Amino acid sequence: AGWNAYIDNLMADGTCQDAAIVGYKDSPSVWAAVPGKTFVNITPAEVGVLVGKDRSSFYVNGLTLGGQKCSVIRDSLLQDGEFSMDLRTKSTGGAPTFNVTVTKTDKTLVLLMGKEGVHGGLINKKCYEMASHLRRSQY
């Protein structure tokens, strides 16, 4: 329970602009998300591609989250040990892009988006430690 607590902790820093906890087994659904941003709009369909078996067009085609187009920098989402995927939003001529990290637990996907100028290495670190935290309550 209390999935909002995890979102609140992830957002306490001020360096992040979006975060969401999404259940992806059977019937994917957003369990907790930042109101009014992009992750709150993820659809079961996009989730299907994330935990998806076909991970080829990822590097050369990217993917989308809550409608937002993204590029894939690294994908170890299913590879054991790491369990995370690092993306960068896709922007227009000169629009600022943002770092995104997706981490997978037993039952959920933890997503985090940083603000402009925040290192990916940091978004990844916070997402990763948060996912580690949830697998302990067997989630």
CSV table of C-alpha atoms in Angstrom, one decimal:
chain,number,residue,atom,x,y,z
A,1,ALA,CA,0.0,0.0,0.0
A,2,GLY,CA,0.8,3.7,0.5
A,3,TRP,CA,2.3,4.0,-3.0
A,4,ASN,CA,2.1,7.8,-2.9
A,5,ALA,CA,4.8,7.8,-0.1
A,6,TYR,CA,7.3,6.6,-2.7
A,7,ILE,CA,6.3,9.3,-5.2
A,8,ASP,CA,6.6,12.0,-2.4
A,9,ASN,CA,10.1,10.8,-1.5
A,10,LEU,CA,11.2,10.7,-5.1
A,11,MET,CA,9.9,14.3,-5.6
A,12,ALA,CA,11.2,15.8,-2.3
A,13,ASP,CA,14.6,16.7,-3.8
A,14,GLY,CA,13.3,19.2,-6.4
A,15,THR,CA,15.6,17.8,-9.1
A,16,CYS,CA,12.8,15.6,-10.6
A,17,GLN,CA,9.7,16.7,-12.4
A,18,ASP,CA,7.7,13.4,-12.9
A,19,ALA,CA,7.6,10.0,-11.1
A,20,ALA,CA,5.1,7.1,-11.2
A,21,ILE,CA,4.7,3.6,-9.9
A,22,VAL,CA,2.9,1.3,-12.4
A,23,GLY,CA,1.7,-2.3,-11.8
A,24,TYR,CA,2.5,-4.3,-15.0
A,25,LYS,CA,1.2,-7.8,-14.4
A,26,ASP,CA,-1.9,-9.0,-16.2
A,27,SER,CA,-3.7,-5.7,-16.3
A,28,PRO,CA,-1.2,-2.8,-16.3
A,29,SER,CA,-2.3,0.3,-14.4
A,30,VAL,CA,-0.7,3.4,-12.9
A,31,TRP,CA,-0.8,3.0,-9.1
A,32,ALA,CA,0.8,6.3,-8.2
A,33,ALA,CA,1.9,9.3,-10.3
A,34,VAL,CA,2.5,13.1,-10.2
A,35,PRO,CA,-0.8,14.8,-11.1
A,36,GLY,CA,-0.8,16.8,-14.3
A,37,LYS,CA,2.5,15.5,-15.8
A,38,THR,CA,3.3,12.8,-18.4
A,39,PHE,CA,3.6,9.5,-16.6
A,40,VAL,CA,0.1,9.7,-15.2
A,41,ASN,CA,-1.0,9.1,-18.8
A,42,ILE,CA,0.9,5.9,-19.5
A,43,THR,CA,-1.4,3.3,-21.1
A,44,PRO,CA,-1.4,-0.5,-20.7
A,45,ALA,CA,-0.3,-0.6,-24.3
A,46,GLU,CA,2.9,1.4,-23.7
A,47,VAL,CA,3.6,-0.8,-20.7
A,48,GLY,CA,3.2,-3.8,-22.9
A,49,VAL,CA,6.1,-2.6,-25.0
A,50,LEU,CA,8.4,-1.8,-22.0
A,51,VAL,CA,8.4,-5.3,-20.4
A,52,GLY,CA,7.9,-6.5,-24.0
A,53,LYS,CA,9.8,-9.4,-25.5
A,54,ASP,CA,10.7,-7.6,-28.8
A,55,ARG,CA,13.5,-5.3,-27.7
A,56,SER,CA,15.1,-4.6,-31.1
A,57,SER,CA,13.6,-1.5,-32.5
A,58,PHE,CA,14.3,0.1,-29.1
A,59,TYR,CA,17.8,1.5,-30.0
A,60,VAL,CA,16.9,2.5,-33.6
A,61,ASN,CA,13.2,3.5,-33.1
A,62,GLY,CA,12.8,4.3,-29.4
A,63,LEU,CA,9.4,4.2,-27.6
A,64,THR,CA,6.8,6.4,-25.9
A,65,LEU,CA,5.5,7.0,-22.4
A,66,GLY,CA,2.2,8.8,-21.6
A,67,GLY,CA,2.4,9.8,-25.3
A,68,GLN,CA,5.8,11.4,-25.0
A,69,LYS,CA,8.3,10.1,-27.5
A,70,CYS,CA,11.6,8.7,-26.0
A,71,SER,CA,14.9,7.5,-27.2
A,72,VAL,CA,16.7,4.5,-25.5
A,73,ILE,CA,20.2,4.9,-24.2
A,74,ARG,CA,20.4,1.7,-22.2
A,75,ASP,CA,18.1,-1.3,-21.7
A,76,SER,CA,18.8,-3.9,-18.9
A,77,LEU,CA,15.1,-3.7,-17.9
A,78,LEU,CA,14.8,-7.5,-18.0
A,79,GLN,CA,18.5,-8.4,-17.6
A,80,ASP,CA,18.8,-9.5,-14.0
A,81,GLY,CA,21.1,-7.5,-11.6
A,82,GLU,CA,20.4,-4.1,-13.2
A,83,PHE,CA,16.6,-4.2,-14.0
A,84,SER,CA,16.6,-0.7,-15.4
A,85,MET,CA,16.4,1.2,-18.6
A,86,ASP,CA,17.7,4.7,-19.3
A,87,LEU,CA,15.9,7.0,-21.8
A,88,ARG,CA,16.1,10.6,-22.9
A,89,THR,CA,12.9,12.4,-24.1
A,90,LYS,CA,12.7,13.4,-27.7
A,91,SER,CA,12.5,17.2,-28.4
A,92,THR,CA,12.0,19.7,-31.2
A,93,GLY,CA,14.7,22.0,-32.7
A,94,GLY,CA,16.4,23.2,-29.6
A,95,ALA,CA,13.8,22.1,-27.1
A,96,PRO,CA,15.4,20.8,-23.8
A,97,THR,CA,15.3,17.1,-23.4
A,98,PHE,CA,15.1,15.2,-20.0
A,99,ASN,CA,16.6,12.1,-18.6
A,100,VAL,CA,14.3,9.2,-17.7
A,101,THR,CA,15.1,6.0,-15.9
A,102,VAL,CA,12.7,3.0,-15.7
A,103,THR,CA,13.3,0.3,-13.1
A,104,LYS,CA,11.5,-3.0,-12.7
A,105,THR,CA,10.5,-4.7,-9.5
A,106,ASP,CA,8.6,-8.0,-8.9
A,107,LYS,CA,5.3,-6.4,-9.5
A,108,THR,CA,5.9,-2.8,-10.6
A,109,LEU,CA,7.8,-0.4,-12.9
A,110,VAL,CA,9.2,2.6,-11.1
A,111,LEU,CA,9.5,5.6,-13.5
A,112,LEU,CA,11.4,8.9,-12.9
A,113,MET,CA,12.0,12.0,-15.0
A,114,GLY,CA,14.5,14.7,-14.0
A,115,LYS,CA,14.4,18.5,-14.7
A,116,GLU,CA,16.6,20.2,-17.3
A,117,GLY,CA,20.3,19.9,-16.5
A,118,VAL,CA,20.1,17.0,-14.1
A,119,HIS,CA,22.6,14.1,-14.9
A,120,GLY,CA,21.1,10.8,-16.0
A,121,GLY,CA,23.4,9.0,-13.7
A,122,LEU,CA,21.6,10.7,-10.8
A,123,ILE,CA,18.0,10.0,-12.2
A,124,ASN,CA,19.1,6.4,-12.6
A,125,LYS,CA,20.6,6.2,-9.1
A,126,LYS,CA,17.5,7.5,-7.4
A,127,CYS,CA,15.2,5.2,-9.4
A,128,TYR,CA,17.3,2.1,-8.8
A,129,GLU,CA,17.6,2.7,-5.1
A,130,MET,CA,13.8,3.2,-5.0
A,131,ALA,CA,13.1,0.0,-6.9
A,132,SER,CA,15.5,-1.8,-4.5
A,133,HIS,CA,13.5,-0.5,-1.7
A,134,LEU,CA,10.2,-1.9,-3.0
A,135,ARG,CA,11.4,-5.4,-3.8
A,136,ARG,CA,12.1,-5.7,0.0
A,137,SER,CA,8.4,-5.5,0.8
A,138,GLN,CA,8.1,-8.1,-1.9
A,139,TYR,CA,6.7,-5.7,-4.5
